[PDB]
Amino acid sequence: YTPIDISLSLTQFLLSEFVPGAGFVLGLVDIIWGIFGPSQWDAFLVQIEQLINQRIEEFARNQAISRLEGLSNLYQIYAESFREWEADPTNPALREEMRIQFNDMNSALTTAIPLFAVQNYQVPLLSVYVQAANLHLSVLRDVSVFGQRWGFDAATINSRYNDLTRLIGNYTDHAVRWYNTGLERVWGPDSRDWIRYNQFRRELTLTVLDIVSLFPNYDSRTYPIRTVSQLTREIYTNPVLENFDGSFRGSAQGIEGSIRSPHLMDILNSITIYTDAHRGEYYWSGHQIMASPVGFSGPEFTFPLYGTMGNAAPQQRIVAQLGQGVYRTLSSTLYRRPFNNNQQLSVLDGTEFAYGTSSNLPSAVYRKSGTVDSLDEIPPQNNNVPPRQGFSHRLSHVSMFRSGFSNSSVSIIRAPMFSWIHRSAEFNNIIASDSITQIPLVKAHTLQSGTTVVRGPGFTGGDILRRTSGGPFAYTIVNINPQRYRARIRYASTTNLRIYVTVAGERIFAGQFNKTMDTGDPLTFQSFSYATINTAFTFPMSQSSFTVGADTFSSGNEVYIDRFELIPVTA
């Protein structure tokens, strides 16, 4: 029912079944554009108005909704026209309609996008804007790969491809511009301001940012074959903070500060919870987390203590990661609002950890279960299977916003922050043939000195690595699935430089590449480019080591790398 439900089901369709044809077009109508009436575009608008406390003026609101329902009729016609032509691609009448349907569908999308960027209303119309933007690029990709078989000429086919590459950027820049602007207009000093701030961050990551991160994959000339992306970013939930209503007039920075800093991806192995108690009320006081690197090549590190190590109950409540990991939490909150030390409480007295499998697997119950369901905020991506099987995110970290002490404090809050990484972020770095595999560099094993993980711009799928002086970036383990590959790095830089790759520690291939931006410049879609290394190579071992670095530039510049790509040579 909710747009967050719908956007996650669309994201997986754009990750797994992202090959063009009749099946891809039949999918867009069956998830988004098959809606009759306005009851689905209304909900897509309400989900952001309810968040920013401002409704779109009804003229621009009806005009945008009716413009969508107009596109919804046109694309259904375009869809059924595509299906007829694929079943018989020689019929001249089917090819003529195919050219006519695209020319009408393209022009009608070009005329409809301005209605989703109305003056002083671009932020609420954003999820609708990216929905229409995703549709415009898909049909501009169809002509680049099928237009020559429809009857289009080389000149008009090439003209539409330059529209494809230009709009992958201008749509993205518009989305990140008004995501950041909308994020700021909600951020505030007090507690309920942060709740609105993190909810805006969570719901628009799922309904906007996760979709825009896949726009580059429509480039049929950059990705001539199949490609798979990995969303490594984390989004957060707080059962204690979100379940109650009263705004704790304290620190929104203190909560945001309790979020972990940009980091390499790690697999949450286990968590040990310590239990304190106050006036006959036992609760989750603190915990300790153990995690492992991507793949499992290194040992497992343990994080410093979160919270206080209370022994009101035995510490033995260690919870592991099994099956596909933890997909869902059912927490129970304990509040205590006395009347003017006299302790206040804002803690948890129980949480169920549900496991992801295609079969039965019993939960991990800390003390007891509750009805503060993370599934209500992390909905599943597949709905025709039980949520345990069709989950969209896996638990990756459990930090905590903490405050107060049982000794000498009047108020106490122990609210763990649940970090949810996307499911597409695989446990290991699998390198596949017959497909262009994308490994975001945050999936690396270790960083070398002088390499910084920095918050991503918003369109890369996650955070990125940064370096300001020549040297290796990170060292990552790969797994290969008679094949040789071409190395391609998506990078940003303020200087001409040399990007190199090192395979198994021995052979090393490099290349001279160009700068993309000036110094003191925001990270824009145009600031990123593809640096392809010419020579192709093999992997000695079935599990290899892959180093990517950059040098030959004056110190004091900025070099960003989002990911590297491995391209099969045969295809």
From TrEMBL:
Source organism superkingdom: Bacteria
Gene Ontology terms, MF aspect: signaling receptor binding; toxin activity
Keyword Amino-acid biosynthesis in record: no
Residue ranges of the TM segments: none
Entry keyword set: Sporulation, Toxin, Virulence
Domain annotation Pesticidal crystal protein: ranges: 18-219, 227-426
One BP annotation, GO: sporulation resulting in formation of a cellular spore
The keyword Nucleotide-binding is assigned to this record: no
Family: Belongs to the delta endotoxin family.
Protein name as it appears in the record: Crystaline entomocidal protoxin
Gene: cryIA(c)
